[PDB]
Design a protein around this ligand. Structure first.
Ligand SMILES: *[C@@H]1O[C@H](CO)[C@@H](O)[C@H](O)[C@H]1NC(C)=O
Lengths: 430, 145, 97
């Protein structure tokens, strides 16, 4: 059983996860015999040649990656030739046959998160290379949810009267004395982006950042860790699970030279999706074996250019098998719908704290936003006083008021002044 | 792809044609790789792509100039994904720069099964801000609709 | 030189403790009204301390920091740049050459 090997030249950790997936899921019943191709993914021509090459070799299924420029070629060709395509790459909008998309939809999780933080007005940064789909989603929801959204393309922030035009924009959004920004680019590029944001904005304080990716813990957060800024994100890989922890240990045990970038405490979510893809294909072929359906091709597939193009009938069955597969994996529960989209997926909501990244809850299709919660100032100067007029008096309604805000008088204002000059936080007690 | 390959095999010097936003990347890439000149009435490709000759002029500058002429600080922008997102990016970036409040709703995906539901949801989405000014950027049939 | 110097050892601190000890230290500096500070640290520790300063909000005007290492441009000064506090240091590598 031969399968397609389409890979970007810069894909290494995903390649390593692919090989590890092959070794781990290897069985005596059947051989997967993967044929690896290294090509430029953005080029439509190269993708066409690679796909037609895999078709010439007569592979049963194909695994690869696609950029927003090369997507429609893959969808159209796999659609016409009835060949199954499995990918970690971003999920296509709308319904498509013969394509299996490993990564869960990030739209719903993002919307639910924004709604959970109760943001009325915010800025959304985007890169035109990755695509506007999520932006289109949040804009579509912006009208109904009463959101005021400043959409900034990270592509050119460079001049526009230099800092002067964009600074007004960037610091306009300050509301709670907190500025709110959603990133959604890619990890490294995101670090560069937030740096550039601090540069052009000239304001370093009061940021609440939302990184939109399944890769929240997959990169170094130390540079963005303390600006005094809140950082929230999404994690598709839960390390609390036994499978993931074991895999992490063995992954960390591996040598560096044999598998490129093979050993790290964490793992790229796309790589994990490639591993999961290997497992899913294995299970699909095994299920094709158990159901006694013959998927083996009698003759050569031929040329993809040939007209009219000849699809294989059993290919439909292969697709069916791939869609019927439900297994446990690094991305959580893996199940597929009739369109190929992920279902039942669980996306972890993360907040970055002093002690490092933690999980505040999870998001699901049916469950929407679910907070885990379950859980103290460092120093507080205690100020004692007695209630007397007009030194310390109770406000008219102190019942709906909490803390020190319910005490007013000469001594209160005086305390505020003293604590302002000496620079300590205080608590008024009677 | 098959048509282009056919024309290449026939050995034609130049190719005239139209393209959807789905087939544009393939056309530009193939014309760039095989050095075959393409002449098109279709929307100008977004990029520097070589070997492609687009007869249609770009409307972005004219549009933004007209908006700036009518002095609109708030408007509704209706668009379909069929011709590309370039103009959308332009009006959004400029919306940020000039402090415009813009409601951009994608009408591109719509069901003929239920037209009424979708249209009702759209107009009810517009009626919240009471938009009296709308920009229709669409294929002609959708414009008529 | 008749200098009054308050010397603090920032060397030994638990990474778990982190911000808390720094908060205590800088608050104790604020009560003493010490507006002038010399870091004397490698780029890592300098970055940590600067982060702390920006969080507690002591990077505003009226504070004068001197970073003593030859690595003045090696650490991240981008975040403390717009605070308004004067930050001086030493650079052994000139990009003008
Ligand atoms: C997957 O979905 C089913 C739906 O019935 C649910 O019962 C199950 O708990 C889900 N699995 C995980 C790991 O969330």
């Amino acid at each position: 059983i031969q399968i397609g090997g389409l890979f970007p030249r810069g894909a290494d950790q995903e390649y390593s996860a692919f090989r590890v997936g092959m070794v781990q899921f290897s069985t005596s019943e059947f051989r997967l015999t993967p044929h690896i191709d290294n090509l430029e993914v953005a080029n439509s021509f190269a993708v066409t040649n690679a796909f037609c090459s895999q078709f010439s070799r007569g592979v049963y299924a194909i695994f690869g990656f696609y950029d927003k420029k090369s997507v429609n070629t893959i969808t159209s060709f796999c659609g016409t030739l009835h060949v199954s395509f499995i990918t970690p790459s971003f999920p296509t909008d709308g319904t498509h046959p013969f394509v299996i998309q490993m990564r869960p939809d990030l739209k719903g999780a993002l919307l639910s998160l924004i709604e959970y933080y109760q943001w009325d007005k915010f800025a959304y940064l985007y890169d035109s290379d990755r695509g506007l789909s999520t932006l289109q989603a949040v804009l579509d929801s912006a009208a109904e949810k009463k959101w005021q959204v400043t959409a900034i393309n990270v592509g050119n922030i460079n001049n526009d009267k230099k800092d002067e035009t964009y600074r007004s924009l960037f610091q306009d959004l300050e509301l709670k004395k907190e500025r709110r920004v959603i990133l959604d680019c890619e990890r490294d590029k995101v670090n560069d982006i937030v740096d550039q944001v601090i540069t052009i904005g000239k304001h370093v304080k009061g940021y609440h950042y939302i990184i939109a990716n399944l890769g929240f813990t997959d990169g170094d957060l130390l540079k963005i860790q303390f600006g005094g800024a809140e950082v929230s994100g999404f994690q598709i890989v839960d390390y609390d699970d036994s499978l993931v922890s074991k895999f992490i240990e063995r992954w960390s045990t591996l040598e560096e030279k044999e598998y490129p970038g093979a050993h790290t405490a964490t793992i790229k979510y796309t790589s994990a999706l490639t591993y999961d893809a290997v497992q899913v294909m294995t299970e699909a072929f095994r299920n094709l074996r158990k159901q006694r359906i013959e998927i083996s091709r009698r003759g050569n597939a031929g040329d993809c250019l040939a007209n009219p193009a000849v699809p294989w009938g059993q290919g439909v069955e292969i697709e069916r098998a791939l869609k019927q597969v439900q297994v446990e994996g690094l991305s959580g529960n893996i199940k597929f719908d009739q369109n190929g989209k992920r279902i039942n997926y669980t996306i972890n909501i993360m907040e970055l704290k002093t002690n490092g990244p933690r999980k505040i809850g999870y998001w699901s299709e049916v469950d929407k936003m679910v907070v885990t919660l379950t859980e103290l100032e460092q120093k507080t100067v205690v100020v004692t006083t007695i209630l007397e007029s007009p030194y310390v008096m109770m406000k008219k309604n102190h019942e709906m008021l909490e803390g020190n805000e319910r005490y007013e008088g000469y001594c209160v204002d005086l305390a505020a002044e003293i604590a302002k000059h000496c620079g300590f936080k205080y608590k008024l007690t009677i």
